[PDB]
Design a protein around this ligand. Structure first.
Ligand code: G5Y
Ligand code: MN
Ligand code: MN
Length: 180
């Protein structure tokens, strides 16, 4: 299915993680296959982002992909010893150079469309939003893209490749029309 492609095209850590997320909350990766793909994809971006970051070793902190006990434990740890307000939801990363949380968005829609939807869901938070499409289009609050272009090129390419792999297997049209 989709399932095969997912298994073929994402490192096991990411698959295992995706599956547990879905199975925990009663969702079947054999059935909600497009969703399975989307979780993997988002998680991989979240990791790739935090990889890219010789003086500030470990620029980013990863909150996505952890369980919620660890997640809030991390969030709370950061809040106590910096001052930064507590977010209502668990966001994806924390940034130590710019001292702000990041919410990572990946969308098969338009970027400004998805951007708005997320900014509406987290109106009360000073959280940086960065949105990636599968078209090499991004959008970031106050157009502060946080990463150097090299790092952003890498991400855009991974996404475009995922799209073209799916398209290659006649999986893209299903996937595209299945967001939200
Ligand atoms: O953390 C989440 O639950 C989450 O859900 C949907 C889209 C995201 O980007 C995200 O971080
Ligand atoms: Mn998240
Ligand atoms: Mn996210």
């Amino acid at each position: 299915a989709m399932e095969d492609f997912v298994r073929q095209c994402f490192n096991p850590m990411i698959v295992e993680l995706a599956e547990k997320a879905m199975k925990e909350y009663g969702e079947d990766p054999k059935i909600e296959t497009n969703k399975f793909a989307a979780i993997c994809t988002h998680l991989e971006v979240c990791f790739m982002y935090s990889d890219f970051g010789a003086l500030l070793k470990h620029r980013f902190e990863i909150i996505e992909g952890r369980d919620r006990i660890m997640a809030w434990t991390v969030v709370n740890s950061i809040c106590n010893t910096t001052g930064v307000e507590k977010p209502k939801f668990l966001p994806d990363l924390y940034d130590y150079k710019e001292n702000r949380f990041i919410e990572i968005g990946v969308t098969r829609r338009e970027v400004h469309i998805y951007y708005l939807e997320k900014a509406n869901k987290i109106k009360s938070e000073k959280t940086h939003i960065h949105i990636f499409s599968f078209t090499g289009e991004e959008m970031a609050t106050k157009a502060d893209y946080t990463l150097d272009e090299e790092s952003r090129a890498r991400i855009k390419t991974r996404l475009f490749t995922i799209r073209q792999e799916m398209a290659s297997r006649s999986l893209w049209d299903s996937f595209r029309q299945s967001e939200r």
